[PDB]
Amino acid sequence: SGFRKMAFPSGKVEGCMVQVTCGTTTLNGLWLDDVVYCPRHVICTSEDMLNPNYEDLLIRKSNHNFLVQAGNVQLRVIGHSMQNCVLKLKVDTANPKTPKYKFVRIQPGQTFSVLACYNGSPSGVYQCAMRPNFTIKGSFLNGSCGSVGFNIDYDCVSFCYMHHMELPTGVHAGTDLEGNFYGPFVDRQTAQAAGTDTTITVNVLAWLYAAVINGDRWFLNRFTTTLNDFNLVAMKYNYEPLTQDHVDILGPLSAQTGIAVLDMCASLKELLQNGMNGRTILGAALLEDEFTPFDVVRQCSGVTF
Amino acid sequence: SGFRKMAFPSGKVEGCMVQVTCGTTTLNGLWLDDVVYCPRHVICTSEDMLNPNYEDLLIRKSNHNFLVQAGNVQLRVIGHSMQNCVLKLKVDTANPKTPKYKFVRIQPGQTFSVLACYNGSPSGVYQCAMRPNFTIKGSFLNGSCGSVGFNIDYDCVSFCYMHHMELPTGVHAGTDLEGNFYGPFVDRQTAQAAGTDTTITVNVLAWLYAAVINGDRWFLNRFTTTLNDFNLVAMKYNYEPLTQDHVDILGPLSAQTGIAVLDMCASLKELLQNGMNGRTILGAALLEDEFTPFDVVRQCSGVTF
Numbered sequence: 282s283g284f285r286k287m288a289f290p291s292g293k294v295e296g297c298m299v300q301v302t303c304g305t306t307t308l309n310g311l312w313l314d315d316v317v318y319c320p321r322h323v324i325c326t327s328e329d330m331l332n333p334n335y336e337d338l339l340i341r342k343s344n345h346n347f348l349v350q351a352g353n354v355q356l357r358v359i360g361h362s363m364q365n366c367v368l369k370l371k372v373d374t375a376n377p378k379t380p381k382y383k384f385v386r387i388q389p390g391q392t393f394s395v396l397a398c399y400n401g402s403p404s405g406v407y408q409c410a411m412r413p414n415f416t417i418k419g420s421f422l423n424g425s426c427g428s429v430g431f432n433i434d435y436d437c438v439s440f441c442y443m444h445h446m447e448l449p450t451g452v453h454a455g456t457d458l459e460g461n462f463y464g465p466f467v468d469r470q471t472a473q474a475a476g477t478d479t480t481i482t483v484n485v486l487a488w489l490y491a492a493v494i495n496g497d498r499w500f501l502n503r504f505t506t507t508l509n510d511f512n513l514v515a516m517k518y519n520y521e522p523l524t525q526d527h528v529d530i531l532g533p534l535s536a537q538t539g540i541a542v543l544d545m546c547a548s549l550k551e552l553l554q555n556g557m558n559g560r561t562i563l564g565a566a567l568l569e570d571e572f573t574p575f576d577v578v579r580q581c582s583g584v585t586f
Numbered sequence: 587s588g589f590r591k592m593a594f595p596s597g598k599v600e601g602c603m604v605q606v607t608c609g610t611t612t613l614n615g616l617w618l619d620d621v622v623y624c625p626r627h628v629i630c631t632s633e634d635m636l637n638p639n640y641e642d643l644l645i646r647k648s649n650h651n652f653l654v655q656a657g658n659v660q661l662r663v664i665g666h667s668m669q670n671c672v673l674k675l676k677v678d679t680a681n682p683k684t685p686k687y688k689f690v691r692i693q694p695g696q697t698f699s700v701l702a703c704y705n706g707s708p709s710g711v712y713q714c715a716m717r718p719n720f721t722i723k724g725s726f727l728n729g730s731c732g733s734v735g736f737n738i739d740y741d742c743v744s745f746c747y748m749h750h751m752e753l754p755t756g757v758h759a760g761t762d763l764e765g766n767f768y769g770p771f772v773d774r775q776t777a778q779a780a781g782t783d784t785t786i787t788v789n790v791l792a793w794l795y796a797a798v799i800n801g802d803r804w805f806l807n808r809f810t811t812t813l814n815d816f817n818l819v820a821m822k823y824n825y826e827p828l829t830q831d832h833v834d835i836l837g838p839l840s841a842q843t844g845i846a847v848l849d850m851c852a853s854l855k856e857l858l859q860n861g862m863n864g865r866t867i868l869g870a871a872l873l874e875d876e877f878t879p880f881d882v883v884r885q886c887s888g889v890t891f
């Protein structure tokens with residue numbers, strides 16, 4: 282019993298983290314087979330970042346200008362290309378610790394684990410989500426660029442996120458592993474501002490299902506609603522619109538607890554309009570939206586890897 | 587920038603988790619060198635747990651009654667003893683993945699990472715703390731007994747916690763790695779009730795320091811206080827008494843932000859008496875007490891392992 286913000290075990294990913302230096306700049310890379318992936322801005326000065334021209338900055342560089350360090354030992358770079366906003370450095374050795382893996386582009390509302398790294402060494406693991414405005418609310422100091430977000434299915438690690446930028450807001454932006462940013466962000470130091478951070482409604486409903494499974498039941502109400510009425514009240518609180526696919530995804534949680542999905546929405550409606558009245562739900566005083574419906578099923582049943 | 591509940595990378599500990607079976611019961615063990623550690627209740631039936639006599643239950647068992655499985659392959663048990671509430675099974679192979687390690691008994695207020703496991707396989711990693719009443723608020727289903735809590739210092743893993751019991755409250759209890767429970771709990775299914783869960787005051791102050799470092803500054807006040815006055819108000823809210831050693835431990839955070847420790851207490855005093863007024867601090871609406879002062883320093887500076 283009990284419910285915690287839980288991240289995947291990071292062992293499979295620890296053994297893929299390297300340090301990449303290009304002259305004055307150092308960040309982290311992902312070494313999978315004989316390729317090392319890292320943010321293309323490794324090749325910039327701090328001055329270069331107000332208006333960099335990456336194709337021109339790259340002509341100065343040769344295979345040997347990139348120093349890749351895997352723990353203690355150096356890897357030899359034999360080839361380098363730029364793909365969108367990531368650099369792919371071809372090394373001579375395949376990583377002996379390469380797990381089974383996939384590159385996936387996730388969608389807003391999905392969650393993943395971040396292995397935070399500095400100079401190729403893992404510092405910590407935490408769970409976060411792709412906000413609807415395509416930022417993530419992470420924990421990233423300078424030198425952490427190149428840390429990756431991942432999901433593990435049994436034996437296969439699905440890489441979905443590489444860290445690249447911190448917005449002046451203190452929130453973060455990055456790419457998938459083919460180098461395309463999530464959302465409208467770019468790897469330049471300019472006036473980029475994130476949009477409205479709305480709350481991920483399906484995830485909140487998932488987390489309320491987790492609550493009644495685990496004891497907290499005071500918020501269960503005597504009301505029901507419809508999707509259209511609920512969504513009226515959800516727009517006023519900057520909550521994602523709830524859709525019929527979200528309803529289906531919550532079916533298994535609905536089935537396990539005997540609480541129809543629309544009844545739980547009516548419970549959620551009243552928490553938005555009346556507040557928490559100083560009470561708690563799973564030890565929080567605000568509504569948590571960083572568990573997906575699959576996270577709840579997994580943690581409440583014992584799924585391993 | 588940003589601040590997250592962060593757990594240590596679990597790689598060093600993943601490679602030590604095994605499955606232990608004793609007839610009908612299966613749980614997890616910790617394989618360090620040529621010893622496997624696990625809760626002694628592996629040897630009980632479900633009926634045995636209302637009133638077990640462990641020394642008598644153990645006479646029935648022989649070296650070969652314990653089945654230890656390390657991923658796929660079986661380990662051969664050549665010796666077994668009971669130490670307080672843990673069993674130590676002597677196997678013929680040393681673990682080739684044994685890291686540098688220590689057994690430590692932590693004190694209330696200290697934090698650590700849990701690697702949750704079922705049938706010897708890691709399911710997830712999260713951070714928690716030893717509450718002042720000597721429980722932990724974990725995430726543990728049946729079969730998770732034997733999961734361990736640990737802290738990593740650079741290369742050395744300090745093991746501090748093994749999971750054993752879930753109280754009827756839904757909170758959890760366990761032992762250090764020499765088998766002694768934290769607090770007054772026992773490995774029997776009886777009416778054991780946890781005491782008042784007080785809030786860890788030094789940890790809250792640490793987390794407010796983390797806030798001003800990261801932007802949230804609305805709660806900074808115009809007042810100061812003294813230890814005795816603050817502790818008067820802390821007792822009424824079931825907050826641990828703040829001591830002069832706690833003041834010293836917070837010195838480095840005091841030095842970095844220019845905010846004297848007692849000024850931050852006066853800020854905390856007003857949050858207890860006036861509430862949050864619907865505002866947030868680092869994205870929470872209640873005060874968080876599961877970061878120690880050393881956690882804050884570490885996450886805000888980039889300490890790796």
Ligand SMILES: [Cl-]
Binds near residue numbers: 869
């Ligand atoms: Cl909260």
